[PDB]
């Protein structure tokens, strides 16, 4: 088969300036007749791919007219003359030379901003969900930049680990920010052994770790 | 409105079937190859199989040992994939497509997948169906609320907020899947603080695999 490689893995680049995503494929997609066959789509978070550039550098209908395709043989380029905030996603190169079909590995445009220290929320467990026996203790991380954060919990000052999991969402599309939630999940009885439930929060924006914490549950 | 409309995903049991179809509209069906992709949970695009317009020609991925059999019905203009033996690493959102170009001949594939569907996720796995518990995340400046949605399977489950009138701010996290065999996830919005206990506030959480729609109300403490 035809093996397709991307370059780079993840770019980020800031609104404003230009995107070059490589895609080097290991048999020569030029045909006699002058053309590559070679393809770019753009996945968005949660959606079906989308054609971006046919033919190797045809822009399809309807797609923005700051992309371009370029290349020839077995070197291509998806070049983003003005990278914008909603170009945040996974971008893949396709061959349509030969079956069967075969994409590139994928490359993942993150769009850098100006740091932006996470808005930290704790929320207790419902008494709806202690009726049911367990209990569980989530902690917001809200709209921060750049992605790494740290969360540390504490039950009466005790350091949690191995018992917290963590979910973060993808780049928001339009403020190109993340959240992040870690959820402490214990049974009633557990929960009820402790009073002081503490989230410690670290964050390039911080100039210090922020903490949020409860009583009750005892 | 070229429109291309996956249905047929669903849970499925190792080593049972399932058929997939594809609903299209919007243009001439019977003048197109038709292309079925799938994207398996955090990897990329795999090719799966295209049939040509009248359905002479079907060809498959080999890696798929002939478990899969792609047809055609242009009459209904609609596109199947049936796909037999199933086995775990079939799990995947699978979407059709259509294709501008035909082959150009001598085993050359179909060109420019111009419109794709929205997909259709089939989970291979032994599990039951199970519905999810809906719990508030009770909360001037800004305050932060939202549900919490647990222990159910399998994905996905779809999460609004005022019956979809409440989207700023809001974030729904990636589901985690649990010791227990179950996802559970979070769905947080911030509003502002002036508005708790004046504006009321629900999410509506809808698991398709249950049937199951839950609607929460979340109230300050
Ligand atoms: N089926
Ligand atoms: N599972």
């Known amino acids: 088969d035809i093996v397709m490689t991307q370059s780079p893995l993840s770019l980020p680049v800031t609104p404003g300036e230009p995107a070059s995503i490589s895609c080097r494929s290991s048999?020569?997609?030029?045909?006699?007749?002058?053309?590559?066959?070679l393809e770019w789509y753009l996945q968005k978070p949660g959606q079906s791919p989308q054609l971006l550039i046919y033919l190797g550098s045809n822009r399809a209908s309807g797609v923005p007219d700051r992309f371009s395709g370029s290349g020839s043989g077995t070197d291509f380029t998806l070049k983003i003359s003005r990278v914008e905030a909603e170009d945040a996603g996974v971008y893949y190169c396709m061959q349509a030379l030969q079956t069967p079909l075969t994409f590139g590995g994928g490359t993942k445009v993150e769009i850098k901003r100006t740091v932006a220290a996470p808005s930290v929320f704790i929320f207790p467990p419902s008494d709806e969900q202690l009726k049911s026996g367990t209990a569980s203790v989530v902690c917001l991380l809200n709209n921060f930049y750049p992605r790494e954060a740290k969360v540390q919990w504490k039950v009466d000052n005790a350091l949690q680990s191995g018992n917290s999991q963590e979910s973060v969402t993808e780049q928001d599309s339009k403020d190109s920010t993340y959240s992040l939630s870690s959820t402490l999940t214990l049974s009633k009885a557990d929960y009820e052994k402790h009073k002081v439930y503490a989230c410690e929060v670290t964050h390039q924006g911080l100039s210090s770790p922020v903490t949020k914490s409860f009583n009750r549950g005892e | 409105q070229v429109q291309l409309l996956e249905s047929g995903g669903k849970l499925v049991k190792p080593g049972g079937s399932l058929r997939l179809s594809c609903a299209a509209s919007?243009?001439?069906?019977?003048?197109?190859?038709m292309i079925w992709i799938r994207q398996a949970p955090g990897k990329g695009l795999e090719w799966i199989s295209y049939?040509?317009?009248?359905?002479?020609?079907?060809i498959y991925a080999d890696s798929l040992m002939g478990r899969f059999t792609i047809s055609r019905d242009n009459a209904k203009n609609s596109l199947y994939l049936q796909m037999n033996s199933l086995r775990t690493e079939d799990t995947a959102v699978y979407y059709c497509?259509?294709?501008?170009?035909?082959?150009?001949?001598?085993?050359?594939?179909?060109?420019?997948?111009?419109?794709w569907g929205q997909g259709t996720l089939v989970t291979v796995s032994s599990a039951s169906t199970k519905g999810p518990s809906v719990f508030p995340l009770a909360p001037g400046g800004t305050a932060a609320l939202g549900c919490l949605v647990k222990d159910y399977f399998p994905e996905p489950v779809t999460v609004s907020w005022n019956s979809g009138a409440l989207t700023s701010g809001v974030h729904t996290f990636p589901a985690v899947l649990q010791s227990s065999g179950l996802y559970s996830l979070s769905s947080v919005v911030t509003v502002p603080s002036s508005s708790l206990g004046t504006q009321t506030y629900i999410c509506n959480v809808n698991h398709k695999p249950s049937n199951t729609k839950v609607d929460k109300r979340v109230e300050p403490k």
């Open positions: 049939i040509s317009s009248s359905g002479s020609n079907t």
């Open positions: 048999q020569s997609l030029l045909q006699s007749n002058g053309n590559n066959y």
């Open positions: 497509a259509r294709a501008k170009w035909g082959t150009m001949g001598r085993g050359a594939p179909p060109t420019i997948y111009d419109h």
């Open positions: 919007g243009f001439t069906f019977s003048d197109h190859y």
